Amino acid sequence: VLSGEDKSNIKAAWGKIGGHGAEYGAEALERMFASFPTTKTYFPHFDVSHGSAQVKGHGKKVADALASAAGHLDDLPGALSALSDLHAHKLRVDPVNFKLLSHCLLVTLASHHPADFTPAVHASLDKFLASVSTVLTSKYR
Amino acid sequence: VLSGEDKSNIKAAWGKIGGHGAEYGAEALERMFASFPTTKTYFPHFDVSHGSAQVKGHGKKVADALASAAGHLDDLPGALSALSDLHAHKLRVDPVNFKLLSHCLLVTLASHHPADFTPAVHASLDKFLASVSTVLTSKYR
Amino acid sequence: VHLTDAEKAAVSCLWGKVNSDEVGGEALGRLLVVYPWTQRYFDSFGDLSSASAIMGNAKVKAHGKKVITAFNDGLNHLDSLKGTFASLSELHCDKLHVDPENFRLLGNMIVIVLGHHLGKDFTPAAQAAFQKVVAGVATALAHKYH
Amino acid sequence: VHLTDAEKAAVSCLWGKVNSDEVGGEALGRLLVVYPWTQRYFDSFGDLSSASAIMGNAKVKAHGKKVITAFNDGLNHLDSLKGTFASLSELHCDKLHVDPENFRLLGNMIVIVLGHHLGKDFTPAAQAAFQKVVAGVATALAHKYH
Numbered sequence: 001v002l003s004g005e006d007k008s009n010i011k012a013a014w015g016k017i018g019g020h021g022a023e024y025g026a027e028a029l030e031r032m033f034a035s036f037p038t039t040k041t042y043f044p045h046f047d048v049s050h051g052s053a054q055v056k057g058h059g060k061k062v063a064d065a066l067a068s069a070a071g072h073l074d075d076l077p078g079a080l081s082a083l084s085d086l087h088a089h090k091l092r093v094d095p096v097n098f099k100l101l102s103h104c105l106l107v108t109l110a111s112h113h114p115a116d117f118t119p120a121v122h123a124s125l126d127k128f129l130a131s132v133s134t135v136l137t138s139k140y141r
Numbered sequence: 142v143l144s145g146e147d148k149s150n151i152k153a154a155w156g157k158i159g160g161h162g163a164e165y166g167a168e169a170l171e172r173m174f175a176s177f178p179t180t181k182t183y184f185p186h187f188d189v190s191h192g193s194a195q196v197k198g199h200g201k202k203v204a205d206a207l208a209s210a211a212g213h214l215d216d217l218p219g220a221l222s223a224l225s226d227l228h229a230h231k232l233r234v235d236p237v238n239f240k241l242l243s244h245c246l247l248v249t250l251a252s253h254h255p256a257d258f259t260p261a262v263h264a265s266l267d268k269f270l271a272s273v274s275t276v277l278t279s280k281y282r
Numbered sequence: 283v284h285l286t287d288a289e290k291a292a293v294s295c296l297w298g299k300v301n302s303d304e305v306g307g308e309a310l311g312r313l314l315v316v317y318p319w320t321q322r323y324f325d326s327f328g329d330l331s332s333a334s335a336i337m338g339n340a341k342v343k344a345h346g347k348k349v350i351t352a353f354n355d356g357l358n359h360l361d362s363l364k365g366t367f368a369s370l371s372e373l374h375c376d377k378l379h380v381d382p383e384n385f386r387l388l389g390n391m392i393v394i395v396l397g398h399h400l401g402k403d404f405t406p407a408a409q410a411a412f413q414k415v416v417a418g419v420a421t422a423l424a425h426k427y428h
Numbered sequence: 429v430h431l432t433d434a435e436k437a438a439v440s441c442l443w444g445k446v447n448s449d450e451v452g453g454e455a456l457g458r459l460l461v462v463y464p465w466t467q468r469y470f471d472s473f474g475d476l477s478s479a480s481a482i483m484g485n486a487k488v489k490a491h492g493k494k495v496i497t498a499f500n501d502g503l504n505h506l507d508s509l510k511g512t513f514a515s516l517s518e519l520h521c522d523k524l525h526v527d528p529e530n531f532r533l534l535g536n537m538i539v540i541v542l543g544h545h546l547g548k549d550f551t552p553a554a555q556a557a558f559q560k561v562v563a564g565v566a567t568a569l570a571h572k573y574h
């Protein structure tokens with residue numbers, strides 16, 4: 001869908017996040033590894049332990065890509081088409097991990113920001129993580 | 142995200158089928174209901190026995206709908222637009238079920254086109270549905 | 283499922299530290315707001331118009347308790363994760379026609395509610411404890427299939 | 429997961445018709461063709477470029493029989509099934525790093541291929557009769573993932 005409310009909540013809650021998005025992107029990644037130890041396969045160069053500078057470093061990127069993306073809500077392909085190629089062709093990521101990542105990505109915002117994390121936003125968000133996950137999943141099908 | 146030589150094969154492979162089109166869907170549905178029983182409950186009114194005017198009845202229009210799709214791939218949302226919300230808010234069909242059907246429709250097509258069911262073709266068809274099933278479910282979220 | 287003695291340790295204090303009522307209701311109502319197509323098994327709760335009503339619906343709430351109370355049954359039965367749901371894998375597939383993927387989906391919703399309600403106390407580790415916990419029940423709910 | 433011979437034997441009977449080999453290298457090549465992100469962990473494997481490449485790859489063809497021999501090892505031990513794919517499960521987790529969903533995705537290739545080989549001899553009552561068994565293999569290689 002991606003209608004009015006979505007944009008409101010999608011943009012309106014990605015601010016409550018402010019400069020925290022990257023520690024959040026860090027926290028989400030780290031969550032994945034504990035709950036899904038397979039997600040660790042795509043990251044064997046990284047030092048995967050809790051406070052790691054790579055995960056932190058990488059969290060900042062997965063913050064930015066999204067923060068940018070959460071902006072250009074009207075063209076979600078093209079802001080993310082820097083990243084389709086990489087995940088889809090150059091990384092041969094498995095489509096299933098975006099389900100995994102975006103879940104972790106949310107749990108974190110729920111935990112760090114309950115008052116905001118209302119079903120409606122929660123709902124506008126998953127509708128949007130899926131949109132990203134969608135585009136990334138684009139380039140091999 | 143399909144193409145560019147994918148439409149050729151879709152059409153190409155969808156080429157063999159012709160008048161045999163309607164009948165396929167019909168049996169695929171049976172397969173579903175055999176393979177994935179709970180799918181049945183979307184058809185409480187249908188008689189689900191091996192032979193059915195009722196499943197041959199809806200099936201043909203299943204088969205049409207795709208056959209229509211195979212002729213308008215530059216926008217299939219726009220075509221499948223009728224069936225689009227019909228499945229979303231009227232019928233409330235579970236997304237997990239569409240991949241369920243694809244699989245069964247594909248098991249159908251390969252019983253019937255042993256010499257045309259090739260990996261390039263098979264893939265070009267998994268795609269076909271993927272986009273269709275995807276386009277179809279665009280009115281949930 | 284395997285949970286290290288350290289792992290059932292955290293399962294226990296957290297689920298203790300946490301009401302346990304609104305989780306189910308807050309968990310449930312989220313499912314049908316997040317994934318609305320799942321309300322098709324609930325048209326006798328009447329008004330599932332919007333997130334508001336959805337959350338504020340005594341039968342959404344009352345079933346929520348119902349789910350967890352039995353979602354708790356498994357927390358106190360971890361290894362024996364089967365027979366609990368002996369019946370109940372039965373309803374949810376045979377008398378109510380549920381899609382077993384949706385057991386995960388509710389599973390994943392409970393996981394998010396446990397971290398809504400705990401905030402900083404939900405470790406990626408503590409989270410990973412419950413993920414097996416969720417998966418176990420979720421898997422144990424969609425087992426009836428012959 | 430077991431069945432009245434009525435369908436439980438159709439399998440034992442229907443697998444008898446088919447080569448348990450030209451099917452494996454058939455279903456695995458296809459796995460790699462329809463889901464092409466699957467060629468990761470296939471880099472000791474060589475040219476997979478075009479469906480004709482993949483199809484005509486004597487590694488894929490080679491691995492065909494193995495994945496099948498195992499599949500057979502199930503086919504005999506239809507009950508055991510979790511404690512017999514025990515060895516490959518740790519191997520498909522902690523050294524090949526497979527994601528548990530592609531077992532189902534291979535399974536599906538085995539079924540699509542099984543009626544590619546058999547056309548009409550294969551029918552819903554017999555088709556799904558195999559599904560139960562494919563879907564039981566996917567759930568047997570993915571038990572040790574945790």
Ligand code: HEM
Pocket residue numbers: 039042043061062065066083087091093094097098101132133136
């Ligand atoms: C939707 C959420 C995701 C977004 C927005 C995203 C996007 C990105 C971005 C921005 C980068 C770094 C580019 C740079 O270094 O400048 C990256 C790299 C990478 N991503 Fe993702 N990605 C996502 C999910 C995933 C998932 C689920 C996986 C699988 C576990 C994954 C695997 C990787 C890998 C292996 C790299 C290369 C790491 C490196 O740069 O050394 N990503 N992705």
Ligand code: HEM
Pocket residue numbers: 180183184199202203204206207224228232234235238239240242273274
């Ligand atoms: C590409 C896949 C699909 C196609 C081409 C398709 C096609 C159609 C069409 C054309 C109609 C209404 C046409 C008429 O007036 O008779 C319809 C409705 C319906 N579809 Fe879908 N559909 C698809 C997916 C699914 C799936 C996955 C399910 C399983 C839940 C499903 C179940 C139904 C049901 C129960 C109806 C209403 C039944 C009835 O009219 O008696 N469909 N579909």
Ligand code: HEM
Pocket residue numbers: 320323324326345348349350352353373374378380381384385386388389419420423
């Ligand atoms: C996986 C954890 C789940 C648990 C612990 C659980 C628990 C329950 C319980 C305790 C009941 C009441 C039946 C009784 O009184 O015995 C019930 C019924 C029901 N459940 Fe679930 N359930 C789960 C998953 C699901 C899922 C995934 C759905 C999907 C929509 C669902 C939908 C329903 C529906 C429609 C009823 C009928 C209740 C009514 O009369 O409105 N449940 N379940």
Ligand code: HEM
Pocket residue numbers: 466469470494495496498499516520524526530531532534535565566569
């Ligand atoms: C679904 C049924 C499957 C069965 C029965 C199976 C079985 C096997 C067997 C028997 C071996 C080698 C054992 C040996 O001869 O030492 C093996 C290795 C391997 N498996 Fe599978 N597997 C299955 C699915 C998959 C899937 C879906 C993938 C990934 C998409 C996969 C990836 C691999 C890889 C990359 C190897 C290479 C290691 C070697 O050279 O032995 N398997 N598997």
